[PDB]
Ligand binder design. Structure first.
Ligand SMILES: CCCCCCCCCCCCCCCCCC(=O)OC[C@H](COP(=O)([O-])OCC(O)COP(=O)([O-])OC[C@@H](COC(=O)CCCCCCCCCCCCCCCCC)OC(=O)CCCCCCCCCCCCCCCCC)OC(=O)CCCCCCCCCCCCCCCCC
Ligand SMILES: CCCCCCCCCCCCCCCCCC(=O)OC[C@H](COP(=O)([O-])OCC(O)COP(=O)([O-])OC[C@@H](COC(=O)CCCCCCCCCCCCCCCCC)OC(=O)CCCCCCCCCCCCCCCCC)OC(=O)CCCCCCCCCCCCCCCCC
Ligand SMILES: CCCCCCCCCCCCCCCCCC(=O)O[C@@H](COC(=O)CCCCCCCCCCCCCCC)COP(=O)(O)OCC[N+](C)(C)C
Ligand SMILES: CCCCCCCCCCCCCCCCCC(=O)O[C@@H](COC(=O)CCCCCCCCCCCCCCC)COP(=O)(O)OCC[N+](C)(C)C
Ligand SMILES: CCCCCCCCCCCCCCCCCCCC(=O)O[C@H](COC(=O)CCCCCCCCCCCCCC)COP(=O)(O)OCCN
Ligand SMILES: CCCCCCCCCCCCCCCCCCCC(=O)O[C@H](COC(=O)CCCCCCCCCCCCCC)COP(=O)(O)OCCN
Ligand SMILES: CCCCCCCCCCCCCCCCCCCC(=O)O[C@H](COC(=O)CCCCCCCCCCCCCC)COP(=O)(O)OCCN
Ligand SMILES: CCCCCCCCCCCCCCCCCCCC(=O)O[C@H](COC(=O)CCCCCCCCCCCCCC)COP(=O)(O)OCCN
Lengths: 63, 47, 161, 61, 205, 111, 438, 82, 375
């Protein structure tokens, strides 16, 4: 959500200045964010598969 | 064993080393952005 | 002068047996020598490497400890430690990182208990331990399912893996 | 086994089969030269080593 | 000298002076001069104004320390269990008291510094030592025996370190250059620069 | 019960299996006393019994700091007298606040 | 000079190629050959060349090596005392450590570059950390003390050397530079303050001496304390004279306080090595103050008194090590009747203790007379202060001697042929210097 | 037997004091997340801070060091109570 | 089109090596030395200056001790990302390069963990990921505000300065290194604690990313030293040493001393190689001595460069702090020596794969005298 907010700000700036830099940076954000999310979801699934029986909320480290 | 010649040769070597170091310490910024400080340097940018 | 020499006792006389409750719930008779620390006797018996953790002190990580439950009658033989020193620091990190909530009033570490004659047929149990990490080689995922022995580990202690 | 395309060096590590390619043949001949030169150097060293020359042989069963 | 007969070192004539000669023909400076805000904050004329200008630093530091401790407490409290007590009622005293006591210590320090400098009329080490001594005395009002001695000493020592390495040190080594000829020795034949080296631009962050 | 370990001829061998105790360098070792050992341990580790008391602060200040203050005052007086003796201007010493820059006398100058 | 440096580099080199059973013999031969090379360096050093007898450079400012009056005396002293250390030490590990330490220390003395001096002198930092913290007879606390003290003082010295190299462009002694800055002067001074044990930075030396081996203690007392005066004459006084004259009352305060409190602390010792180690600290203050006067008498007297200390304190440490081998004790209270039980050891012990009390037929007398004369040239009270409080040394030396001298003992603990061979050179050198061949 | 240091306190009382460190341990990401965020915003705000005297800066650093509580200290002493 | 060919050749090289490795995948060669040499050759086509040659040298020395085609391929990806970080001219280049490098770090961390090590390694990777997302999101938000306000994307701004502070791992941004590198493979920790820094240093020097504030380097120095002295585990000691040293190097680099930091990073790579790839006690002892800054080895030269640059700028507080914090860190290094030779008998794995370890120890001992001109 935060990355989308930043990419939208860049598109807004591109419309404001009639410039193509923000459009390029926004497609770059989309690609990098999607790759990061895929890898992170891989790590989350692998982390959940290695949980021991005693571990209760493995995914919720923030507890 | 000419001690005077050895002494003066050694001192000359050390003094030359000091002069070379102080020349070596005269350094402006080598930053690629810094075209003002390096205006006279011959460079080509491929960008 | 020249008082009487005392012949030493053979191994049979100075062997005490301790009944140890393992993590699975089975009771093991661990024969041990008087004068040996509890951690060494437990290691020699053939308990798995997950049952033990290195002593988390600056210079004591070569020693292998265990979280053990000691009956009230044998609390006297546990060794006193000075809080203003770093041995207490090893002990405090071992509670903070390994034992955590699984602590009980009977919780102790094996190295600070020395076996003697009066501790014969003492019943102790391995205390539950939380997942811990020092190095990727020296860590505990939380699964007590490896069938190795801490004896068969020649590695002295944790360093850069 | 599952695969039958395993390299011959992998299947016969003790002795590689007879060289068939030109490069392999050249390597074989170079190895022969190296073996002879090494044995010559071995004997020259054994002369300096003295009586016995640190020679070794197979022992009887 | 490197001999056992005459004293080591040397002496310079006090009557003879050497005319200053410029290190370079044209001087380009990348060091910016002090801002008007810095001179305003450094002004100790009015002790109340000096105190009120410099306390926001102390209050900020106290707020970070209190926030650190309050978060250490908050992190521990269990979300899954509903708590009978109110967490902010527990946590607010921490931050508020830390910030208040820090601000009070900084206020004593700045006020005593300005008052001593005004009364003495001179800028000196002693103003910082006395302000630090008073602040450390306030720190150790009801504390056990070593602490009445140690805190006045530590709090007094801190301004001495600040003065020694923040003011005396830079001013002692302004002249030394590192390029061309040594500052004392221009008679020696070293490469003389038209311009001083600019290793970086004036900063703007 | 004892035997001579050392051999001047050079045919020395250590009889680790010998029934008789060798007369080696440990033969002359001092027997030692339990309480003397504990006194040595106590005396070396006397920092354990250190306690900050007003009496301790009083002693430390009055003797150590007092001797430092006395020595510094005496040295300053001697420096002042020597400056008057030599004819030098009052020297700018580190903690003396003097409006003179005289530090090292010029050898060439006549004072 | 070149021969001496080559032999200094050859000694550690030989250990790599020796059979590991010939190591002791090869090391002893190498030590004696280095001593002979030092004698050759003295022979090729003409007094006509007044500033520096010899200067050699091997391609850079760092590789500039030279000998002066102080450097030549200290280098001959270390080359003289090293063989005794070699025979006292057994094992390839110990031999390697001690040879590397001696190579680094002896290269430091003749170095003329502050940065190279720092690099060679601190190369022996872990070697003492390992040496003093050896398995059974070492203490980790003492090794930590010495290592940390040396690191902080040497880092301050290094920062001052960097500032000098930036400002002047050179940090070699042969190039005349003067500075009036007090920060750089203190940066150079702090190393001297720590290395020459001066109150309150003297705590490392005692713990190190007690828990170091006898060869290690001999080297530490003999030449590592003297490295302070090489640094003072070579790298501090030529450039930092203005600061020493500015701070002279403070310098006297610290030096005389070190003398007095070290003397008083010596009185509370029950361990023989600690008694000798504290005597060394009290002895260093006169040297430091005499040099700091920056007069012809002071420099010569300080270097002379350093030679006297480097001939007397190694002997006391060697005798104590021999007694500890014979008795397995260093407590004065356990040791009694040594006069009757060890007449030959007792004679040399009394002789060296008289040397430490600066009696006339010993080099310490001549050296002390010169140093006190320099102090009297500065002011009368300066000499009077040192002369009076010298009586404190007599009290503790006499108490130790009286405790050891008589009593009841059932053990013959007297030195063997090897031990007598070990101290004979030191006794001969002490006599020769005492009659005036300083 | 050898001379040994006297250990103040009783064995079981000292062990009970040490056992007060065995409490539920939060994971450090929660602290790190907030420190990272507020630190980024803090570095942005610092460039706008007024220039302070070196003496005041050093005193502020001293006060912050004195006021800083080690994470273990809160761990041992934390009570889930009013 | 010819200027584009220089960059295109590197792609074509990497792609054909990738497809050749995929085709020639067999149990007979699990250690693919041939593709490692091919990758090393391919990375020579990206050398254009001295800093790029240093990048190539470290990249090759790293790729020697990775095992397998796949990890070597991701090290090549890290090299490409680093090469573009050096050449980045505005916000977009910086962002693209550095989060590509972050992706390579995540992949390398994931693929060098055993099944028994997944519970902690994947946790550390996830925590690193979330912290990196914080840093990148703040960077790009402020970049959007700047691009709106100024109309141009200029890499000389506070935003990139703070983002590069996160990348360096200084003062409040060093915790991701502590959490991640504690739980990952020793080679992964070694290569990603040294190699990334060179690109950031080059970007800072060339694009004038310097601030007047000295708080962050000072905080890095003091915090690193004190935490190193208080840390029980050996990995944390080594990790905190880097925080302290990189804070000091950051203080030096802001003032324009690019040459000295470029020498320091290389000497630090060589010094850390031996302690991280611990196989012999003596090699680790020399490495630890070199990291301390100790005189007989090349590490003394590298630290001396930074300290010599410090006295030139004439900031007294920094020098005083440097001395005291250096002593505090020296205590921890002495702890490391004590643990090996003075605590207990030590037995280690016989991992006889010292590819460049012996060469690195030789270079640390030898290289002091040739490089003495620098200081
Ligand atoms: C809601 C979120 C919660 C956080 C709220 C804030 C969020 C952050 C916002 C902005 C953050 C940026 C600025 C914050 C400071 C930067 C630190 C940081 O971010 O690192 C990440 C850090 C976590 O990193 P970590 O790696 O996980 O923890 C490492 C430790 O081992 C941690 O393990 P530990 O805690 O168990 O161990 C602590 C250890 C760690 O060691 C340190 O803390 C190092 C700190 C040393 C000073 C740091 C450099 C100071 C330079 C400041 C520069 C500005 C001034 C310039 C001039 C100053 C000249 C010096 O120190 C100690 O043992 C306790 C003593 C603490 C100070 C020690 C020095 C004592 C000197 C006093 C002498 C008097 C005694 C005399 C009598 C003695 C008798 C014998 O996060 C924080 O700690 C932030 C907490 C914010 C509270 C700070 C309060 C004051 C801040 C300003 C004052 C500056 C002094 C620093 C005090 C201590 C700070 C740690
Ligand atoms: C043989 C002659 C070599 C002598 C001169 C070299 C120049 C000619 C290069 C000829 C190649 C020889 C390689 C030697 C150096 C490499 C440099 C280089 O190559 O580019 C520089 C050169 C021009 O750059 P430049 O001379 O540096 O001047 C540009 C500006 O001045 C901007 O550059 P800048 O940064 O130098 O600016 C001046 C700088 C002044 O900077 C300096 O003073 C430099 C100091 C020398 C440091 C040397 C160590 C560097 C380590 C790199 C090792 C070289 C790896 C070789 C890689 C390429 C292999 C060919 O001032 C500064 O303040 C900047 C800071 C510089 C960094 C600080 C220096 C510290 C270095 C780290 C030392 C730490 C100690 C480590 C341990 C050492 C212990 C002993 O570019 C070229 O000539 C073309 C490069 C082409 C390379 C490969 C292309 C041919 C093959 C293409 C197809 C490949 C695929 C087929 C493979 C075929 C084989 C299977
Ligand atoms: C286990 C040991 C058993 C063996 C015991 C050995 C016994 C030793 C005998 C004691 C010797 C006493 C001699 C003392 C005089 C010192 C000798 C000496 O120094 O030689 C002088 C020559 O002088 C003499 O020969 C003196 C004659 C000695 C005989 C005179 C009568 C003997 C009575 C003894 C009184 C001596 C008191 C002197 C006090 C200092 C060298 O002459 P120069 O060339 O000028 O040397 C330069 C001077 N300087 C050494 C300072 C560098
Ligand atoms: C002026 C120099 C000073 C500046 C220094 C920087 C410049 C460096 C110049 C010298 C660099 C020398 C680097 C030495 C590396 C050591 C060689 C090495 O690592 O070999 C490995 C290589 O390991 C491999 O992984 C092999 C794969 C790669 C093989 C080499 C690839 C060659 C690519 C071509 C490079 C040519 C350069 C391209 C054009 C410049 C073999 O060791 P292992 O088998 O893995 O384990 C050793 C076990 N033990 C020692 C204990 C017995
Ligand atoms: C690292 C230095 C830190 C000091 C360590 C001292 C021991 C710490 C104990 C804490 C006590 C607080 C610190 C006081 C030290 C200052 C010395 C007092 C001398 C003094 O009062 O004179 C002042 C100037 O000295 C000064 O204030 C400047 C003198 C600088 C201090 C001495 C520097 C060298 C000391 C290093 C010793 C060894 C280092 C180991 C710590 C007044 O001067 P004024 O201008 O105000 O005139 C007055 C016109 N109203
Ligand atoms: C917290 C730590 C500190 C707390 C405890 C400190 C208590 C100690 C205070 C008393 C110390 C002894 C007295 C010396 C200081 C006196 C006051 C200093 C002022 C001063 O210098 O006056 C001079 C004192 O006489 C002198 O020159 C010195 C005479 C006393 C020295 C001889 C007495 C002891 C002898 C033992 C040997 C020690 C010295 C060895 C060399 C004479 O005035 P002025 O004519 O010089 O003009 C100088 C202008 N103020
Ligand atoms: C702008 C900055 C403002 C100022 C800020 C100041 C902040 C503090 C700076 C202090 C820096 C000094 C660093 C030395 C720290 C003391 C040594 C640490 C104490 C210690 O416990 O070390 C143990 C042994 O050390 C020992 O046995 C050594 C004993 C003590 C060494 C003496 C110190 C050297 C001399 C001090 C002054 C020298 C001249 C100063 C100019 C080994 O601990 P471990 O390895 O078992 O680890 C287990 C962890 N508990
Ligand atoms: C409190 C008693 C003093 C303890 C020292 C005892 C004797 C040491 C004397 C060593 C001899 C040479 C050292 C040069 C001066 C060192 C200290 C002299 C006393 C002193 O602090 O004077 C200060 C000036 O020195 C300064 O401003 C700098 C002081 C030293 C800085 C401390 C740490 C520096 C470390 C630097 C490392 C290397 C850096 C190289 C770039 C202030 O006296 P004042 O003239 O202002 O009079 C104002 C009085 N009303």
């Amino acid at each position: 959500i935060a990355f989308i907010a930043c990419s939208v700000n860049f598109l807004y700036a591109s419309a404001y200045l009639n410039d193509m830099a923000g459009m390029l940076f926004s497609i770059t954000i989309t690609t990098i964010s999607a790759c990061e999310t895929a890898l992170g979801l891989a790590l989350c699934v692998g982390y959940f598969q290695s949980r021991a029986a005693n571990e209760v909320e493995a995914l919720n480290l923030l507890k | 064993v000419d001690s005077q010649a050895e002494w003066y040769a050694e001192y000359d070597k050390l003094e030359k080393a000091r002069q070379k170091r102080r020349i070596w310490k005269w350094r402006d910024s080598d930053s690629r952005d810094e075209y003002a400080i390096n205006a006279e340097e011959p460079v080509i940018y491929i960008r | 002068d020249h008082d009487h020499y005392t012949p030493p006792k053979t191994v049979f006389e100075d062997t005490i047996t301790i009944n140890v409750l393992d993590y699975d719930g089975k009771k093991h008779a661990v024969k041990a020598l008087i004068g040996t620390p509890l951690n060494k006797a437990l290691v020699e018996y053939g308990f798995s490497s997950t049952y033990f953790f290195p002593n988390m002190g600056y210079y004591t990580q070569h020693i292998s400890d265990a979280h053990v439950f000691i009956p009230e009658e044998y609390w006297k033989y546990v060794e006193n430690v000075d809080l203003k020193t770093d041995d207490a620091e090893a002990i405090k990190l071992m509670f903070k990182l390994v034992v955590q909530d699984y602590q009980r009033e009977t919780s102790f570490f094996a190295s600070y208990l020395t076996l003697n004659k009066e501790m014969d047929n003492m019943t102790i149990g391995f205390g539950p331990i939380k997942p811990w990490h020092i190095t990727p080689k020296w860590s505990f995922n939380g699964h007590h399912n490896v069938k190795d022995r801490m004896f068969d580990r020649l590695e002295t202690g944790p360093f850069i893996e | 086994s599952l695969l039958k395309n395993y390299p011959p060096s992998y299947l016969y590590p003790f002795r590689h089969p007879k060289p068939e390619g030109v490069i392999e043949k050249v390597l074989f001949n170079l190895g022969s030269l190296f073996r002879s030169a090494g044995q010559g150097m071995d004997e020259l060293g054994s002369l300096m080593l003295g009586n016995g020359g640190m020679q070794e042989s197979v022992g009887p069963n | 000298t490197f001999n056992y007969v005459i004293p080591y070192g040397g002496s310079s004539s006090y009557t003879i002076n050497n005319e200053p000669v410029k290190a370079e023909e044209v001087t380009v400076d990348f060091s910016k001069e002090p801002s008007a805000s810095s001179l305003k904050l450094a002004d100790k004329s009015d002790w109340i104004a000096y105190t009120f200008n410099n306390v926001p630093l102390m209050a900020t530091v106290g707020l970070l320390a209190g926030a650190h401790e309050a978060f250490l407490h908050y992190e521990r409290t269990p979300i899954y269990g509903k708590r009978t007590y109110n967490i902010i009622k527990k946590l607010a005293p921490i931050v508020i008291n830390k910030t208040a006591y820090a601000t009070l210590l900084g206020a004593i320090f700045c006020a005593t510094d300005a008052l001593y400098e005004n009364y003495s009329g001179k800028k000196s080490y002693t103003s910082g030592m006395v302000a630090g001594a008073a602040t450390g005395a306030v720190f150790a009002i009801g504390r056990p025996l070593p602490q009445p001695l140690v805190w006045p000493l530590v709090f007094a020592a801190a301004p001495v370190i600040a003065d020694l390495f923040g003011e005396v040190y830079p001013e002692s080594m302004k002249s030394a250059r590192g390029y061309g000829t040594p500052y004392g020795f221009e008679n020696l034949d070293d490469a003389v620069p038209t311009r001083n080296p600019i290793r970086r631009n004036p900063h703007h962050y | 019960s004892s035997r001579i370990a050392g051999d001047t001829t050079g045919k020395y061998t250590p009889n680790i299996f010998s029934p008789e105790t060798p007369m080696d360098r440990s033969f002359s070792h001092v027997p030692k006393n339990p309480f003397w050992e504990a006194w040595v341990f106590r005396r070396d580790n006397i920092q354990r019994e250190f306690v900050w008391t007003w009496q301790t602060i009083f002693d430390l200040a009055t003797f150590v700091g007092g001797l430092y203050v006395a020595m510094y005052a005496t040295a300053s007086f001697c420096s002042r007298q020597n400056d008057k003796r030599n004819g030098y201007p009052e020297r700018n010493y580190y903690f003396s606040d003097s409006k003179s820059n005289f530090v090292i006398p010029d050898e060439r100058e006549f004072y | 000079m070149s021969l001496y440096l080559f032999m200094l580099f050859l000694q550690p080199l030989s250990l790599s190629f020796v059979s590991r059973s010939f190591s002791k013999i090869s090391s002893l031969m190498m030590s004696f050959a280095t001593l002979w090379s030092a004698v050759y360096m003295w022979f090729t050093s003409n007094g006509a060349n007044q500033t520096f007898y010899q200067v050699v450079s091997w391609g850079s400012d760092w590789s500039t090596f030279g000998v002066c009056y102080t450097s030549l005396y200290i280098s001959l002293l270390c080359a003289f005392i090293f063989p005794i250390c070699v025979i006292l030490v057994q094992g390839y590990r110990a031999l390697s450590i001690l040879i590397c330490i001696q190579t680094a220390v002896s290269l430091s003395i003749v170095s003329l570059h502050m940065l190279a001096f720092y690099a060679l002198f601190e190369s022996s930092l872990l070697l003492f950390f390992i040496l003093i913290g050896r398995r059974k007879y070492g203490s980790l606390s003492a090794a930590y003390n010495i290592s940390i003290y040396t690191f902080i003082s040497a880092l301050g010295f290094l920062i001052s050397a960097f500032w000098l190299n930036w400002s002047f462009g050179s940090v070699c002694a042969l190039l005349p530079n003067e500075e009036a800055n007090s920060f750089v002067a203190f940066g150079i001074f702090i190393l001297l303050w720590v290395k020459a044990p001066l109150v309150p930075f003297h705590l490392w030396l005692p713990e190190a001496h007690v828990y170091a081996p006898t060869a290690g203690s001999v080297l530490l007392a003999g030449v590592l304390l003297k490295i302070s005066i090489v640094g003072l004459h070579v790298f501090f006084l030529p450039i930092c004279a203005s600061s020493i004259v500015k701070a002279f009352p403070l310098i006297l305060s610290i030096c005389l306080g070190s003398f007095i409190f070290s003397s008083f602390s010596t009185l509370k010792q029950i361990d023989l090595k600690k008694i000798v180690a504290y005597s060394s600290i009290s002895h260093m203050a006169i040297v430091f103050l005499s040099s700091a006067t920056n007069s012809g008498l002071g420099i010569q007297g300080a270097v002379l008194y350093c030679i006297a200390h480097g001939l007397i304190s190694p002997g006391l440490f060697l005798l104590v090590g021999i007694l500890y081998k014979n008795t397995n004790t260093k407590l004065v209270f356990y040791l009694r009747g040594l006069s009757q039980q060890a007449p030959v050891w007792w004679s040399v012990w009394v002789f060296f203790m008289l040397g430490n009390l600066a009696f006339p037929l010993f080099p310490n007398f001549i050296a002390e007379v010169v140093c006190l004369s320099a102090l009297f040239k500065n002011h009368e009270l300066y000499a009077y202060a040192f002369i009076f409080f010298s009586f404190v040394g007599t009290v503790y030396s006499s108490t130790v001697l009286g405790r050891l001298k008589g009593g009841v003992s059932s053990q013959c603990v007297d030195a063997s042929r090897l031990d007598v061979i070990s101290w004979n050179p030191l006794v001969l050198a002490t006599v020769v210097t005492g009659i005036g061949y300083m | 037997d050898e001379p040994k240091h006297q250990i103040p306190g009783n064995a079981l009382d000292n062990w009970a004091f040490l056992r007060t460190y065995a409490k539920p341990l939060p994971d450090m990401i929660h602290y790190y997340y907030y420190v990272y965020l507020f630190g980024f915003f803090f570095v942005y705000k610092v460039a706008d801070f007024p220039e302070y005297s070196p003496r005041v800066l050093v005193m502020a650093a001293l006060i912050g060091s004195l006021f800083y509580v080690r994470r273990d200290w809160v761990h041992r002493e934390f009570k889930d109570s009013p | 089109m010819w200027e584009n060919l220089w960059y295109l050749d590197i792609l074509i090289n990497v792609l054909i090596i990738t497809i050749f490795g995929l085709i020639s995948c067999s149990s007979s060669a699990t250690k693919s030395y041939d593709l490692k040499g091919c990758f090393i050759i391919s990375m020579v086509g990206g050398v254009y200056d001295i800093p790029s040659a240093i990048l190539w040298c470290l990249a090759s020395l790293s790729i020697l001790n990775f095992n397998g085609f796949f990890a070597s391929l991701f090290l090549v990806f890290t090299w490409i990302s680093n090469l573009f970080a050096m050449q980045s001219l505005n916000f977009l280049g910086i962002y693209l390069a550095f989060e590509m490098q972050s992706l390579c770090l995540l992949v390398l961390g994931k693929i060098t963990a055993n099944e028994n090590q997944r519970w902690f390694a994947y946790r550390g990777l996830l925590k690193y990921l979330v912290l990196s997302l914080i840093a990148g999101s703040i960077f790009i938000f402020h970049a959007s505000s700047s691009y709106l306000q100024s109309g141009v994307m200029i890499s000389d701004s506070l935003v990139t300065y703070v983002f590069l502070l996160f990348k360096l791992g200084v003062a409040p941004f060093h915790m991701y290194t502590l959490e991640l590198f504690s739980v990952v493979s020793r080679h992964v920790a070694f290569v990603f604690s040294t190699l990334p820094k060179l690109s950031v240093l080059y970007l800072i020097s060339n694009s004038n990313i310097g601030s007047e504030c000295v708080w962050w380097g000072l905080i890095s120095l003091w915090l690193g030293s004190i935490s190193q002295y208080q840390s029980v585990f050996v990995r944390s000691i080594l990790l905190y040493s880097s925080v302290a040293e990189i804070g000091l190097v950051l203080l030096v680099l802001q003032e324009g001393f690019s040459w000295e930091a470029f020498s320091w990073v290389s000497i630090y790579f060589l010094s850390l190689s031996g302690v991280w790839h611990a196989n012999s006690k003596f090699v680790s002892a020399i490495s630890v001595a070199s990291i301390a800054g100790l005189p007989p080895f090349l590490g003394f030269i590298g630290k001396a460069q930074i300290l010599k640059s410090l006295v030139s700028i004439n900031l007294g507080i920094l020098i005083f702090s440097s001395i005291l914090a250096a002593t505090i860190s020296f205590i921890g290094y002495l702890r490391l020596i004590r643990l090996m030779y003075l605590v207990s008998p030590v037995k280690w794995k016989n991992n006889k794969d010292s590819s460049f370890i012996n060469w690195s120890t030789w270079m640390l001992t030898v290289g002091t005298l040739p490089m003495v001109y620098s200081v």
